[PDB]
Write a protein that binds this ligand. Structure first.
Ligand SMILES: CCCCCCCCCCC(CCCCCCCCCC)(CO[C@H]1O[C@@H](CO)[C@H](O[C@@H]2O[C@@H](CO)[C@H](O)[C@@H](O)[C@@H]2O)[C@@H](O)[C@@H]1O)CO[C@H]1O[C@@H](CO)[C@H](O[C@@H]2O[C@@H](CO)[C@H](O)[C@@H](O)[C@@H]2O)[C@@H](O)[C@H]1O
Ligand SMILES: CCCCCCCCCCC(CCCCCCCCCC)(CO[C@H]1O[C@@H](CO)[C@H](O[C@@H]2O[C@@H](CO)[C@H](O)[C@@H](O)[C@@H]2O)[C@@H](O)[C@@H]1O)CO[C@H]1O[C@@H](CO)[C@H](O[C@@H]2O[C@@H](CO)[C@H](O)[C@@H](O)[C@@H]2O)[C@@H](O)[C@H]1O
Ligand SMILES: CCCCC/C=C/C/C=C/C/C=C\C/C=C\CCCC(=O)O[C@H](COC(=O)CCCCCCCCCCCCCCCCC)COP(=O)(O)O[C@@H]1[C@H](O)[C@H](O)[C@@H](O)[C@H](O)[C@H]1O
Ligand SMILES: CCCCC/C=C/C/C=C/C/C=C\C/C=C\CCCC(=O)O[C@H](COC(=O)CCCCCCCCCCCCCCCCC)COP(=O)(O)O[C@@H]1[C@H](O)[C@H](O)[C@@H](O)[C@H](O)[C@H]1O
Ligand SMILES: CCCCC/C=C/C/C=C\CCCCCCCC(=O)O[C@H](COC(=O)CCCCCCCCCCCCCCC)COP(=O)([O-])OCC[N+](C)(C)C
Ligand SMILES: CCCCCCCCCCCCCCCCCC(=O)OC[C@H](COP(=O)(O)OCCN)OC(=O)CCCCCCCCCCCCCCCCC
Ligand SMILES: CCCCCCCCCCCCCCCCCC(=O)OC[C@H](COP(=O)(O)OCCN)OC(=O)CCCCCCCCCCCCCCCCC
Ligand SMILES: CCCCCCCCCCCCCCCCCC(=O)OC[C@H](COP(=O)(O)OCCN)OC(=O)CCCCCCCCCCCCCCCCC
Ligand SMILES: CCCCCCCCCCCCCCCCCC(=O)OC[C@H](COP(=O)(O)OCCN)OC(=O)CCCCCCCCCCCCCCCCC
Ligand SMILES: CCCCCCCCCCCCCCCCCC(=O)OC[C@H](COP(=O)(O)OCCN)OC(=O)CCCCCCCCCCCCCCCCC
Ligand SMILES: CCCCCCCCCCCCCCCCCC(=O)OC[C@H](COP(=O)(O)OCCN)OC(=O)CCCCCCCCCCCCCCCCC
Lengths: 91, 90, 89, 178, 481, 469
């Protein structure tokens, strides 16, 4: 319990402070609780296509970041070969 | 089942040489004295006496010599000094 | 970002102060990853930026593969001992 | 040199040492074997809180006190602070040789630390990589990392002092007849 | 040539099986070659003469004929030639002093001994800080192996001392050399007196160099490794360690420290004098209560090194000449004393405790005569090079600081005390009951001892005979305005 | 070439019988050698330190990364030789060293992960590469699943590496939340001055650095090193360290960090002192690895670290391979085999090795003195370059601590040689079986590099001046 309490306070406060850009530590923590305002949602008409999040993910993953997809294919290959290597006894 | 290879043939290690006759007749008492004297550092302890020697030779004496050597630096010049001349420079 | 941060911190503390069973350690790993992804996705929404969501997708795929490998390791460990101790590692 | 406020700085040190000792006690309580409850953490602390608090007080107080008394800031103050800290830590042995050994050796290690600059990373601006180096120009004053082919004899006389071969005028010039 | 000579080595090894005759022949050729170099050495010039560069980027395996110098530089002046002559005089004697007492794995033993000699000889040729430091350290693993495998009962502790203490000092020297390297972007000894660092940086670099000097000389209070290492070493190790390796520190003072850090050296000289006076007095008195012959002889070297230090740091021509002459004379006489205690007595009786020895004059009159001669040489009887070195060193020390050198004059008495206390018991009284009669000194043992005594007598009667190599040196390093 | 080898190997190994294992490894061995000698000329691309961004700015190729890739290829060649070639042809050695069916694939995938870490220009590339390497390394630790110690080690590795992977991911996402970016290239001097990234970047650095086991998080990895089969330990204690350290050297995200300074000091002290009471060879070598990691950690505090890092990591890799090979070679001369995964466990089992094989002990002496730093061995020049770098930048106290740690670790380095040159009572007379020609030649080449490499020092610096300036 003592270590749990100290760690709770320290880790929670630091995880809220890592987001701020203020020099002063107390201001760093204070910015965390600083959304007392509503965002204004506005319209425009520049998007004529029916592009959703999934479509955009496909677009960037298959063209801008195709290399990442192929490396992920290797990672999945590992997720097959490894389990077989250590859970199956050959011969 | 895990054993060194049977193919290995080990013999004794003999350094060889001619065993000379024993020209020294060892005295156990002298040997024990020499061992005590040689490995004294293994038994040393800080007591009043040994600490006093430590303070005289590792602290006091260096400080005396250092005072003398930094006080008298550049003080004397002797070459060809005549009567009435100062042999000191300060 | 609160929900993700709290989930991550509490899952980490559960992992560390776990003295009960090894499955809790596996679960705490999975839920720490979930908390990180939640924080990331909220920032992705607030920036209207696809990079955060792309990273989140990759995180999901890697968590799947990591789960598969971790459970394979656990089963291989079980094979020799037939049981998992409450210190089973 | 304007003085350190020894009392306030030392009180700050007291607080920080108490906090650090509390944290170390909590970690000690969590890492140990055998039965342990929430109150045994100080019972089975090993006096670790006292270690932290006493070291903090000794070092910070002595450092500030010596700095103010000498009106200097340099490695010697850290030598004194380390001496006091070693005195505190060696008091736990309850033996006079060990108390003396901690005193002098911690004082020497902390003097070595203070002499190098009293930091673990670097003072980047003063370092050779960020400093004027190589051979100086026409008649400029030599700085710490710079090299010359000839220094001014007046500088040598000032730094070494007159005597035992160091003279304001070379001998042969001075003993020339007319 | 190298291919053919390697074939020669290989065939000799195949047929004889013992490499030692080949090593004796190679070392004798090396001595003759150095004498030929001395014949062709110009003395009316303070410039390095037989220069060569190794491991240049244009010719990594050859000699450098390039306009950019990025390899390791070598060459000699008169100062280095003096010590090189001492080295090549000593090496064959260190081979010959173990001719019969090494029986198991002797080829490795002689290889280690010859390698250590060659490394020291190359060290005296080094013309820059890095080449000097490399050859300075390279002896440590060879000595570690030699002492560990072929030393006496306590030789493991001894091998560890000889490695660890010297590494300890050398690493602070390495800090100093790195600082010089990055601050000046040059490391060579030809022009390093042309660079004048700020006094503060000088003061800092001096400390690392002097810590290394303090461990290698050795000086008080970091001397306590030398008696152990000397006592447990085999004979060739002791001869090299006392005759050659300790001289590297004096050479280092002259070559690495004085030309570069002149002003800081002026500032630091009183501290050096404190340390040297402590060395002389305290180690001389500590010798009086030793019970091991080899330990007593080893302790003697430390006090003589203190006198040499006082001479070499005196900022006078007489002091520097005396320091060099003392180094050479000690290199003659100390290996002879180590030969007596750890080569002749130890090979007959296999024991070093002083209580066992008494009255050797009855059955071994020749050995007793050698002991008497070498003892009075070791305490600086005139007409011996030891007296010239000590007398000139004390003159320079007294001029540098009259009180400190005046007190240093007590070393005459103190050395007389410990040495003559040993020899009185060794030669006088009735033959000891604990030992049986053995042979008197052999022809080989007498040959080695005769070489060393004649050398010390020749430079004792006419020390001026070294001046043709050293007269530039006695002016190259003093700092007077 | 690497990806092709992985695909082809998966297919070929799938169609192959367990008796073909060594043959397959031999094939891949020669394949790697060929790639090293026919594709080497590509170094020309980097003349005058030309840098190339590749794969839509996901990857970065320069002379530094090209050199690290060559070094990793060379290491893989050496380590795969130890599985493809039998030391001796007797039954005991068949039992001691038999490669698993899938081990070669796991090695090649892990090497891919390492090389991708080295070339990572974006944080998504870095995380995918880090997880590739981590998962591969867990599987490599587990693949000898008849061993109780290896399976336990694999579990410990999985969990600690998972926690540290989570720390790395959280660091990257905090960086994204502050800058709306995933690349360090977006950092400028102006940005570093304007914003406090220190906590984020140090969190990333610590997440990476605890994965190779710096203090105070050193014991878990040392345990894993002790409890793996020895031929696994040679691989897993080297490759991750190289990949992570090379990435941090090239990224320069912790310059003059106080936290890194303190942890480097702690790592040097823990590595030197904690090696002193060790009696097991692999634990001793693990503490040696910790100390050398601290040495390299010092270079993360300064710019223009490339020459000293590349020199140090190269000579350290060579020495690490040499010492493990020597320990493997000495197995034939010991009286008592402790088990089939770690045939030799205690330093004292090397006692009297000089009487059985004198030149093996000469090789050991050379390697040990290189670790200590005696000139003109390569280790001396590595330490010299590191000292030049840190003193040029004002790290005086750390330079003193470096000297002290070197002296302290010399004691446990000399322990090996000390026992190895003592006397033993029953010494070897003759034996009909000779150790393998291939592995002995490889070990000798490493020894010769350690001994005579200094001859090429000035030539190497000349080339470095045109490819890295
Ligand atoms: C300064 C002022 C110090 C004043 C103290 C003198 C001091 C320190 C010397 C340190 C020198 C450091 C120098 C290093 C460099 C410094 C820059 C040496 O006092 C020594 O005096 C000697 C001579 O009297 C004794 O030697 C021989 O003794 C007799 C045997 O028969 C013969 O009578 C004598 O003839 C012998 O010779 C030693 O036994 C004694 O230790 C310590 O003395 C005292 O301190 C205490 C507390 O620690 C020590 O522990 C106490 O006793 C322990 C059971 O006993 C238990 O633990 C406990 O009951 C208690 O704790 C004792 O040690 C005590 O004695
Ligand atoms: C073999 C034994 C090894 C141990 C001895 C090493 C001790 C190192 C000390 C010496 C040295 C590093 C030198 C490194 C050289 C190579 C390093 C050698 C190898 C290192 C292993 C560190 O000097 C430190 O000394 C400390 C006092 O002891 C100070 O402590 C602190 O004090 C307080 C803070 O204000 C605080 O209260 C607290 O933070 C501490 O109390 C430090 O701040 C100070 O930096 C000095 O370097 C520096 O010198 C100065 C002026 O000299 C130079 O600038 C000069 O400016 C004008 C005058 O200023 C001159 O007109 C001009 O000409 C010149 O430009 C600098 O450019 C710089 O170069
Ligand atoms: C998996 C488990 C997952 C768990 C997740 C939950 C955790 C969330 C956050 C934790 C993240 C991980 C934490 C890691 C440890 C953090 C330690 C850390 O980063 O080094 C510090 C943090 O510098 C802060 O200013 C930061 C100071 C710390 C913030 C203050 C503490 C607040 C607590 C209140 C009580 C970095 O400064 P540094 O070393 O470069 O030090 C200096 C200094 O910053 C500058 O002055 C110099 O210019 C600079 O060159 C440098 O030398
Ligand atoms: C710059 C740094 C980069 C590289 C430097 C490293 C190495 C040097 C460069 C290339 C190394 C290639 C060397 C090829 C030439 C080496 C060489 O004589 O063959 C081999 C070893 O051969 C490798 O084991 C070939 C292994 C090749 C891998 C070596 C890499 C280390 C040694 O002959 P060996 O008389 O004992 O071989 C005999 C003979 O071949 C058999 O027929 C006999 O039956 C048998 O008794 C056996 O003893
Ligand atoms: C015919 C194809 C054979 C090539 C196969 C190479 C395999 C590398 C395997 C293992 C690495 C061992 C060390 C590599 C040597 C560095 C070369 C270089 O100079 O390094 C520099 C960079 O210096 C550095 O940062 C510091 C390097 C630190 C080296 C420390 C060890 C020194 C001792 C080595 C002694 C040399 C032995 C020669 C034997 C006669 C990069 O040079 P570079 O990028 O322009 O490429 C060279 C052109 N190349 C591709 C055709 C070869
Ligand atoms: C409130 C604000 C004020 C307080 C801020 C001060 C923060 C400091 C708190 C530190 C608490 C001490 C941590 C600790 O408890 O360490 C103990 C732990 C195990 O130690 P233990 O089990 O008690 O005893 C073993 C003895 N053989 O050991 C550990 O495993 C912890 C590992 C060390 C902690 C990391 C610190 C890194 C810096 C080390 C400095 C290295 C020195 C460089 C100079
Ligand atoms: C083989 C093993 C050999 C290893 C050699 C010993 C290693 C070191 C042992 C421990 C030594 C600890 C030294 C503590 C020094 C205390 C100190 O504060 O030094 C500061 C002092 C002056 O520094 P500063 O601020 O620049 O004052 C200028 C005024 N002239 O700086 C100085 O002036 C120097 C004071 C100490 C003099 C050197 C001590 C011996 C080294
Ligand atoms: C000038 C002082 C010279 C004389 C004092 C020598 C130091 C000493 O007193 O002995 C070493 C001492 C432990 O030995 P000690 O308990 O004092 O004596 C045992 C029996 N007499 O040593 C100690 O007291 C322990 C002090 C350890 C402090 C280490 C400081 C940090 C070391 C680098 C990290
Ligand atoms: C492992 C430790 C660290 C190793 C690093 C250093 C390794 C060096 C390897 C030893 C090789 C050095 C000795 C050979 C070089 C000298 C060759 C030579 O020719 O010297 C050139 C010099 C000038 O010659 P030149 O310009 O060509 O003009 C001639 C006109 N007739 O001609 C001369 O003036 C003659 C120069 C004589 C120099 C005396 C050398 C004495 C020692 C020679 C062998 C030493 C072996 C040491 C082995 C242990 C390793 C240190
Ligand atoms: C720890 C232990 C470390 C050991 C360190 C030892 C390193 C030794 C490196 C050897 C390089 C130094 C050789 C000295 C050069 C002497 C020489 O000149 O040899 C002749 C030849 C080159 O001669 P050249 O360049 O033509 O100059 C003479 C013109 N009159 O030179 C040649 O043709 C090359 C022959 C030398 C081959 C050396 C092979 C390495 C040893 C196997
Ligand atoms: C290498 C190039 C330089 C070689 C120079 C000398 C060439 C000839 C050497 C020689 O004569 O043989 C040495 C020795 C004797 O040969 P041998 O009779 O066959 O051995 C008995 C068992 N066969 O052969 C042997 O016994 C080999 C036994 C080796 C003993 C290992 C312990 C010594 C380790 C040396 C430390 C080297 C450390 C390097 C670090 C830098 C050193 C400067």
């Amino acid at each position: 319990l003592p270590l749990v309490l100290i760690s709770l306070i320290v880790l929670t406060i630091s995880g809220l402070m890592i987001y701020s850009n203020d020099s002063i530590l107390i201001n760093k923590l204070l910015e965390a609780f600083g959304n007392d305002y509503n965002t204004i949602i506005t319209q425009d008409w520049f998007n004529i296509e029916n592009t959703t999040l999934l479509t955009t993910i496909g677009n960037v993953l298959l063209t801008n970041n195709a290399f990442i997809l192929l490396v992920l294919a290797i990672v999945l290959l590992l997720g097959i070969i490894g389990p077989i290597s250590i859970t199956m006894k050959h011969k | 089942e895990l054993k060194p290879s049977s193919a290995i043939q080990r013999g004794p290690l003999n350094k060889g040489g001619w065993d000379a006759p024993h020209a020294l007749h060892n005295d156990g008492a002298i040997d024990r004295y020499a061992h005590w004297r040689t490995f004294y550092q293994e038994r040393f302890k800080y007591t009043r006496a040994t600490g006093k020697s430590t303070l005289i030779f590792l602290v006091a004496f260096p400080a005396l010599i250092g005072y003398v050597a930094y006080q008298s630096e550049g003080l004397f010049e002797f070459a060809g000094k005549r009567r009435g001349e100062s042999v000191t420079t300060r | 970002m609160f929900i993700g941060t709290i989930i991550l911190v509490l899952s980490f503390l559960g992992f560390v102060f776990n003295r009960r069973n090894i499955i809790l350690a596996f679960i705490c790993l999975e839920t720490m990853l979930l908390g990180i992804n939640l924080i990331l996705l909220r920032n992705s929404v607030l920036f209207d930026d696809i990079s955060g969501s792309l990273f989140a997708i990759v995180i999901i795929i890697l968590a799947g593969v990591e789960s598969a490998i971790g459970l394979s390791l656990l089963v291989s460990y079980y094979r020799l001992r037939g049981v998992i101790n409450s210190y089973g590692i | 040199f304007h003085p350190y406020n020894t009392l306030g700085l030392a009180t700050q040190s007291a607080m920080v040492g108490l906090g650090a000792g509390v944290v170390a006690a909590a970690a000690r309580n969590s890492l140990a074997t055998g039965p342990r409850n929430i109150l045994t953490t100080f019972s089975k602390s090993g006096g670790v809180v006292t270690i932290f608090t006493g070291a903090s007080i000794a070092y910070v107080f002595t450092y500030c006190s010596a700095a103010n008394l000498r009106e200097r800031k340099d490695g010697w103050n850290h030598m004194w602070a380390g001496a006091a800290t070693g005195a505190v830590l060696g008091a736990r042995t309850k033996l006079v040789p060990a108390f003396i050994g901690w005193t002098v050796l911690c004082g020497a290690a902390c003097g070595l630390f203070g002499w190098t600059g009293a930091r673990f990373n670097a003072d980047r601006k003063a370092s050779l990589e960020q400093s004027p180096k190589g051979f100086v120009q026409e008649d400029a004053h030599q700085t710490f990392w710079e090299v010359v082919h000839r220094r001014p004899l007046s500088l040598t006389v000032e730094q070494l002092g007159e005597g035992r071969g160091i003279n304001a005028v070379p001998i042969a010039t001075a003993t020339e007849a007319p | 040539i190298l291919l053919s000579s390697l074939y020669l080595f290989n065939r000799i090894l195949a047929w004889q099986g013992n490499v030692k005759h080949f090593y004796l022949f190679a070392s004798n050729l090396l001595l003759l070659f150095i004498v030929v170099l001395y014949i062709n050495f110009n003395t009316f010039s303070n410039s390095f003469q037989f220069n060569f560069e190794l491991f240049n980027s244009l010719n990594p395996f050859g000699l450098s004929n390039s306009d950019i110098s990025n390899g390791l530089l070598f060459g000699i002046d008169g100062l280095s030639l003096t010590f090189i002559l001492l080295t090549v005089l000593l090496i064959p004697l260190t081979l010959l002093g173990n001719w019969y007492n090494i029986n198991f794995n002797s080829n490795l033993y002689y290889t280690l001994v010859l390698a250590i000699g060659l490394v020291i000889l190359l060290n005296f040729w080094a013309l820059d800080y890095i080449s000097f430091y490399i050859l300075f350290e390279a002896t440590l693993p060879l000595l570690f192996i030699l002492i560990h495998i072929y030393g006496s009962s306590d030789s493991e502790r001894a091998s560890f001392y000889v490695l660890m203490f010297t590494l300890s000092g050398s690493l602070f020297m390495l800090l100093s050399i790195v600082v010089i390297s990055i601050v000046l972007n040059t490391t060579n000894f030809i022009n390093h007196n042309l660079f004048v660092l700020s006094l503060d940086l000088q003061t800092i670099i001096w400390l690392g160099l002097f810590i290394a000097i303090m461990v290698k000389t050795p000086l008080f209070p970091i001397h306590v490794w030398l008696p152990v290492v000397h006592s447990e070493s085999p004979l060739a190790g002791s001869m090299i360690l006392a005759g050659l390796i300790l001289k590297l520190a004096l050479y280092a003072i002259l070559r690495l420290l004085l030309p570069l850090l002149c002003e800081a050296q002026i500032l630091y000289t009183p501290m050096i004098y404190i340390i040297s006076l402590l060395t002389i007095i305290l180690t001389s008195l500590a010798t009086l209560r030793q019970i091991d012959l080899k330990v007593i002889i080893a302790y003697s070297s430390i006090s003589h090194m203190g006198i040499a230090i006082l001479g070499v740091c005196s900022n006078t021509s007489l002091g520097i000449y005396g320091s060099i002459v003392l180094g050479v004379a000690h290199g003659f006489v100390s290996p002879a004393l180590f030969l007596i205690v750890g080569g002749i007595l130890y090979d007959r009786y296999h024991i070093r405790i002083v209580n066992y020895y008494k009255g050797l004059t009855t059955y071994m009159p020749q050995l007793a005569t050698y002991i008497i001669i070498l003892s009075f040489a070791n305490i600086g009887t005139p007409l011996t090079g030891n007296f010239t070195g000590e007398f000139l060193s004390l003159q320079g020390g007294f001029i540098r600081n009259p009180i400190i050198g005046g007190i240093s004059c007590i070393s005459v008495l103190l050395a007389a005390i410990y040495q003559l206390k040993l020899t009185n018991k060794l030669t006088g009284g009735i033959s000891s009951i604990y030992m049986h009669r053995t042979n008197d000194v052999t022809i080989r043992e007498k040959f080695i001892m005769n070489i060393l005594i004649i050398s010390t007598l020749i430079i004792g009667i006419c020390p001026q005979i070294m001046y043709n190599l050293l007269y530039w040196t006695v002016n190259n390093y003093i700092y007077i305005i | 070439m690497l990806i092709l080898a992985i695909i082809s190997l998966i297919t070929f190994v799938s169609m192959s019988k367990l008796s073909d294992n060594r043959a397959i490894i031999r094939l891949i061995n020669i394949y790697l050698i060929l790639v090293l000698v026919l594709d080497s000329f590509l170094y020309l691309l980097f003349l005058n330190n030309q840098t190339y961004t590749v794969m839509g700015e996901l990857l970065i190729f320069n002379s530094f990364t090209f050199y690290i890739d060559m070094l990793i290829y060379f290491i893989m060649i050496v380590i795969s030789s130890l599985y493809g070639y039998n030391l001796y042809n007797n039954n005991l050695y068949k039992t001691l060293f038999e490669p698993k069916k899938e081990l070669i694939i796991l090695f090649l995938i892990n090497i891919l992960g390492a090389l991708l870490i080295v070339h990572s220009n974006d944080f998504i590339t870095l995380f995918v590469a880090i997880e590739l390497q981590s998962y591969s390394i867990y599987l490599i630790t587990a693949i000898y699943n008849s061993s109780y110690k290896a399976s336990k080690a694999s579990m410990l590795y999985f969990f600690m590496g998972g926690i540290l992977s989570i720390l790395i991911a959280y660091s990257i996402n905090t960086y994204y939340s502050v800058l709306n970016s995933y690349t360090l290239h977006s950092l400028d001097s102006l940005i570093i001055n304007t914003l406090d990234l220190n906590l984020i970047l140090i969190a990333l650095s610590l997440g990476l650095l605890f994965k190779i086991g710096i203090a105070p998080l050193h014991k878990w990895l040392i345990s894993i090193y002790e409890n793996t089969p020895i031929l696994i330990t040679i691989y897993i204690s080297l490759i991750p360290k190289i990949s992570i350290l090379s990435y941090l050297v090239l990224s320069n995200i912790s310059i003059n960090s106080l936290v890194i300074s303190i942890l480097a000091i702690l790592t040097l002290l823990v590595g030197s002192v904690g090696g002193l009471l060790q009696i097991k060879i692999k634990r001793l070598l693990a503490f040696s690895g910790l100390t050398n990691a601290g040495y390299m950690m010092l270079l993360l505090l300064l710019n223009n670290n490339e020459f000293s890092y590349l020199y140090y990591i190269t000579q350290y890799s060579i020495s690490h391979l040499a010492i493990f090979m020597i320990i493997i070679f000495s197995i034939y001369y010991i009286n008592y085999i402790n088990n089939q995964y770690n045939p030799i466990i205690y330093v004292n089992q090397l006692k009297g090795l000089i009487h059985d094989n004198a030149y093996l002990v000469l090789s050991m002496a050379i390697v040990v003195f290189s670790f200590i730093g005696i000139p003109p061995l390569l280790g001396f020049f590595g330490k010299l370059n590191i000292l030049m770098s840190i003193l040029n930048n004002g790290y005086y106290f750390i330079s003193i601590v470096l000297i002290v740690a070197s002296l302290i670790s010399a004691l446990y380095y000399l322990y090996l040689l000390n026992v190895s040159i003592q006397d033993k009572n029953n010494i070897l007379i003759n034996s009909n079986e000779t150790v393998s020609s291939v592995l002995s030649y490889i070990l000798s080449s490493l020894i010769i590099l350690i001994t005579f490499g200094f001859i090429y020092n000035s030539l190497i610096i000349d080339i470095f001046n045109v490819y890295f300036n």
